[PDB]
């Protein structure tokens, strides 16, 4: 290496050169994953999604009707404030961080026909803490997740180190899986109908639960997972079983809207709302 000086040269044309296309290296990779010729092909729209259809037909219109506030304008979030130029030291100064927060917050828009809240993604985080001792427990947890979802899990590793809890850094410990589209919908439907009613003293999801912006969550114990039909059908094959966190991500501007949406899909809500 003669130098480390990085410096992209300017060009003399407005044509956008896709460099990947000019090579002959990865001919299978030039095709989109949606295209049949790609090895990455998967039949996406295999059957009619039921929960999605219901949302489209009944709920979406109802949600819109609920969320109509008359002549509602945009509520701007907390943003980085600029300095008043009352001193020459303000001249190339970085902007003041937001008022309360360190990070900037998004603008809350009025709900119209375009931006009605709806389900975006489900994530099922299972971090088994006994797997600090036994790596095989992580594998079993991942399998369980796969069984539940019908989707490929991704392994969670210990990102941090700590002595009090017997935890190393870079150790496989449980798994996660982001469900999207039809599989996610199915999983939600199963949760509503099969699993959550079989939980004994189940009041619902807390109203104090959630993000500030369109994200709601809750968790299932190891006792609760044995109600899933894939696990239930072979209790001999599943001696151990692991709890899980369930992060539901909506297209909701605020959290009460997201809660309302989830209620539309038969999720009970019990606590005192914020």
């Amino acid at each position: 290496p003669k130098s480390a000086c990085s410096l992209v040269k300017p060009v003399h044309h407005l044509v956008k050169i896709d460099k990947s296309k000019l090579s002959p290296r990865f001919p299978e990779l030039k095709y989109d994953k949606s295209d049949i010729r790609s090895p990455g092909f998967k039949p996406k729209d295999t059957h009619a999604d039921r929960l999605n259809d219901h949302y489209l037909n009944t709920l979406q219109s109802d949600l819109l009707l609920i969320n109509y506030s008359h002549n509602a304008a945009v509520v701007k979030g907390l943003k980085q404030r600029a300095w008043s130029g009352d001193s020459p030291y303000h001249l190339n100064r970085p902007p003041k961080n937001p008022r309360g927060s360190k990070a900037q917050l998004p603008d809350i828009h009025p709900i119209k026909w375009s931006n009605i809240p709806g389900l975006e993604s489900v994530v099922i985080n299972c971090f088994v803490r006994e797997a600090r001792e036994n790596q095989l427990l992580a594998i079993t947890a991942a399998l369980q997740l796969q069984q539940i979802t019908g989707c490929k899990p991704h392994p969670i590793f210990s990102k941090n180190d700590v002595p009090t809890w017997k935890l190393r850094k870079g150790h496989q410990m449980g798994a996660k899986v982001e469900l999207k589209g039809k599989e996610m919908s199915q999983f939600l439907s199963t949760l509503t109908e099969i699993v959550l009613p079989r939980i004994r003293e189940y009041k619902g999801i807390s109203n104090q639960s959630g993000n500030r912006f369109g994200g709601i969550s809750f968790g299932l114990t190891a006792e609760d997972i044995k109600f899933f039909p894939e696990i239930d059908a072979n209790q001999d094959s599943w001696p151990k079983t692991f709890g899980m966190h369930i992060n539901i991500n909506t297209s909701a501007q605020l959290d009460y809207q997201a809660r309302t949406l989830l209620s539309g899909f038969q999720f009970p809500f019990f606590g005192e709302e914020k």
Binding site: S61, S69, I139, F265
Partner: protein
């Protein structure tokens, strides 16, 4: 070499793994490939149309609501105020269930509470 627990873990791992479980690649003839493309494109177009229809309907509903609320504001202020309230904790009723594949034995309940 391995314990029974270790064996069972390996089996479980295999269930998830793509090792020696997956078929050959789906090869097509050029005519077949074209037919497939035409199927997919048409479908996509249909889906787009449906989305527009639904979206249009929603827009129309929104416009109607706007028209109503302006009228209400003009006529009866109290009624308008009542209409335009914060519906923060509004919950869909638990009877409005997600429509199943096939219907139940008792289709409709005529008595309640």
């Amino acid at each position: 070499s391995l314990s029974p627990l270790a064996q069972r873990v390996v089996t479980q791992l295999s269930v998830m793994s793509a090792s020696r479980k997956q078929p050959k690649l789906l090869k097509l003839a050029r005519e077949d490939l074209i037919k497939h493309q035409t199927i997919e494109k048409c479908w996509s177009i249909y889906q787009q149309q449906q989305r527009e229809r639904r979206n249009l309907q929603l827009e129309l509903q929104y416009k109607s609501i706007e028209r109503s609320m302006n009228l209400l504001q003009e006529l009866s202020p109290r009624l308008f105020e009542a209409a335009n309230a914060s519906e923060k904790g509004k919950r869909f009723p638990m009877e409005m269930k997600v429509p199943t594949d096939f219907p139940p034995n008792t289709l409709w309940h005529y008595n309640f509470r």
